[PDB]
Design a protein around this ligand. Structure first.
Ligand SMILES: N[C@@H](CCC(=O)O)C(=O)O
Ligand SMILES: N[C@@H](CCC(=O)O)C(=O)O
Lengths: 438, 447
């Protein structure tokens, strides 16, 4: 049986590919001459898959879609305090207003706009890194997330460097307020070379997937970025990535994304998918036309959105079974706050230790324990209450099926186990991969 | 034993409660004279719990925290087109600029600002509804999600209606541009009563949990709002709810919220928790001081954020076992795209096809990706793919798969998207000549 996701994408490409509105970026010939007859799309999933269709293996300069990764690098290289001192978090469009530096927060608005991107590149390796070191770094981060060594399309680089007055202008202005210490030419060149890095739809998908999973590379399970850095990045993309697109992106699409003038659109939906789309021609706001439209279709056809509540919740509890005086409680999945909250509910539900008259409806609902759990997604948390003959003397906490867990989850469960013992219950933790400590 | 969360809240109340900066809303004497020494907090979970501490049961007027709910009611009653024609989605602070109305559509920026909230109330029931009908509707939507009949604190209403020149100004300007049809006084009076609805920290939490779950009441499991509407409301809260707070709320805290000048703060984190916080005094920007500081702490202490990836994913697959010619594939949790993708992955992973799968990537090009895909189990746990890998393990030397048992008993619910995908994956399995018997006791697969 062939996977149905790739067939949907191919069909989508064929459908939306029936037309090709707009025009390629004109600012440079190398991009304007670009063959417009191309259309590709790819999906990178946490499940290590890469569903694709169309011209998904064709390279193209990543342009500003590179902004979120160099941003991540900078945060990793210098820490939040150093980056936030030069780069703001204020949502904004590309148009430059000096008041953002002279007054307001006194720094470029955010890393998605050119002014911010310039400041970010300036920050890359360290306070005294060289021009080459910083570029190598920009090329490196995008390469590490992509999973392969990427290259700069110098033809494009030169082409753009000959017509970069605007970026030089922003760079010079930033220097004026201390945001840039090196020369305008040095930073603009780094930023331009950075935009010239070649990637394919698939590359972008994988790259976005790293952010989508919170810094974990979907193809190797290796943590590429601290979850805190990955969140900051996707947050900023959400606030300004599609700032000037039609309607209101977050409310309409809900898929954090960024478009490049070469036609590539990057998407990253936390906990679900990384998106890459390639379509040369741009709409009037400067985003890939079909690229944008493909994203809107993904959001609707698959009903994906940043605001949907697709969480582990009560499913963190695989099951709760009772054998005489001891109860077996098995956990599973990726346990964070929400997962841990459910576990504690299960523990407390084992009677080892609102007003029902005010809310009669709430009581008739909690009466059919399994039904309410089904309608809400409590997984197997309800089974605990079912377990609670004689008194429970032992509780085995099995974490074999738990993929991973954060300190918050570790802290909560640990505290949970402690209070169980404080009830006189013996608790033995079966943790083969020992992920509970620390 | 005692649930640790409520005790965490209590500590937090005691801690943050050591000080009490800012001051009560000075615009009306009723709110300005309210006892400042009050601080409560509550969390309403999808599971159906209500953890709280402090003055979590003291009523207070919900004020602007009523905006996300009246907005939901309008969408339900009028439909997206009708509302979107009068209420924009553009993020903005409360400061009003007539320019926002000179646009081609002619509408205030969003439902979170007064101008928008006024436009919202005007839409509440229908084109011809009466004043009393709309007010009743506002009080209703809020009551339905709180789980009890709420009431308007008329003492507060009167006090504020005597000093509503600013909102009267917005209402008049909106009329000038055709956003409001009835008198400015009628609409402003409705919106002010709306703000006088009495709620407690617990009420806000439950109400917020309703949005957080996509429109499902955590205490009953009943759907109160279409998920498409719940999402629109939380999106809008995210964009403008805390527009003028210090830093950038979405990035720093990541908990879509809204504060009311009476001291109450609403929270709604998709799929995880509904938040209600109450602390009378406001900061310089006009939000509850401790209320806001409490949300920051909840965000940091519990590592809660709109951007974290707490998804079912591969866990949608409970397990995949095999007995000779048949495979038992059990699913679970709340399945939507995420889970369904993982399921299709498991079905496909069973090599029931005559052809060999297309990896999409070149093994010789990504040696690191191969080595990882080798220890299938390790890659799965490091990822969060649950049991999807057991499928490839089942495929892994003697005998073709003839039967696949797809059990959904452990599945809480599935959305049409996943319901469509799984149905298609099952059809393709049968197209391979594999017998598929779906054990679906609660019939959740059809439609
Ligand atoms: N290299 C372009 C950016 C292209 C884009 O917006 O993606 C510039 O800095 O003007
Ligand atoms: N009812 C108040 C709004 C309170 C709030 O901002 O939360 C007003 O219109 O002035």
């Amino acid at each position: 049986m062939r996977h149905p996701i790739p067939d949907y994408l191919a069909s989508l490409v064929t459908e939306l590919g029936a037309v090709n509105p707009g025009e390629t970026a004109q600012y440079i010939p190398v991009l304007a001459e670009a063959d417009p007859d191309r259309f590709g799309i790819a999906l990178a999933t946490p499940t290590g898959r890469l569903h694709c269709a169309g011209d998904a293996d064709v390279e193209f300069t990543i342009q500003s879609a590179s902004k979120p990764f160099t941003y991540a690098a900078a945060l990793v290289d210098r820490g939040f305090a150093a980056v936030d001192r030069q780069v703001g978090l204020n949502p904004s469009g590309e148009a430059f207003n000096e008041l953002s530096l002279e007054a307001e927060s006194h720094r470029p608005d955010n890393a998605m706009i050119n002014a911010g991107a310039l400041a970010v590149h300036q920050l890359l390796v360290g306070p005294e890194a060289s021009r080459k070191e910083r570029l190598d770094r920009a090329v490196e981060i995008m390469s590490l997330l992509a999973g392969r060594r990427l290259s700069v399309d110098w033809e494009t680089y030169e082409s753009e460097m000959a017509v970069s007055d605007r970026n030089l202008s922003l760079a010079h202005m930033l220097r004026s307020y201390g945001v840039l210490q090196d020369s305008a030419e040095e930073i603009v060149a780094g930023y331009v070379a950075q935009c010239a890095v070649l990637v394919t739809v698939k590359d972008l998908a994988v790259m976005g997937a790293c952010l989508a999973t919170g810094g974990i590379h979907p193809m190797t399970g290796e943590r590429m970025l601290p979850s805190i850095v990955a969140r900051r990045v996707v947050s900023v993309m959400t606030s300004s990535g599609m700032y000037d697109a039609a309607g209101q992106w977050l409310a309409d699409v809900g898929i954090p994304a960024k478009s490049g003038v070469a036609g590539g659109v990057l998407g990253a939906l936390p906990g679900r998918v990384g998106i890459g789309v390639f379509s040369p021609r741009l709409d009037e706001v400067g985003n890939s036309a079909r690229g944008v439209l493909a994203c809107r279709r993904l959001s609707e056809d698959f009903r994906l959105h940043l605001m949907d509540g697709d969480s582990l919740g009560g499913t963190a509890v695989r099951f709760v079974e009772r054998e005489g005086d001891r109860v077996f409680l098995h956990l599973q999945g990726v346990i964070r706050f929400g997962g841990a909250e459910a576990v504690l509910d299960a523990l407390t539900d084992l009677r080892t230790g609102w007003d029902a008259a005010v809310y009669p409806r709430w009581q008739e609902a909690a009466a059919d324990r399994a039904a309410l759990s089904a309608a809400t997604g409590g997984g197997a948390v309800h089974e605990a209450a079912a377990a609670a003959d004689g008194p429970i003397r032992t509780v085995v906490l099995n974490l074999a099926r738990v993929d991973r867990i954060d300190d918050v989850g570790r802290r909560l469960i640990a505290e949970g186990v402690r209070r169980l013992q404080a009830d006189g219950v013996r608790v033995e933790v079966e943790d083969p991969e020992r992920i509970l400590p620390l």
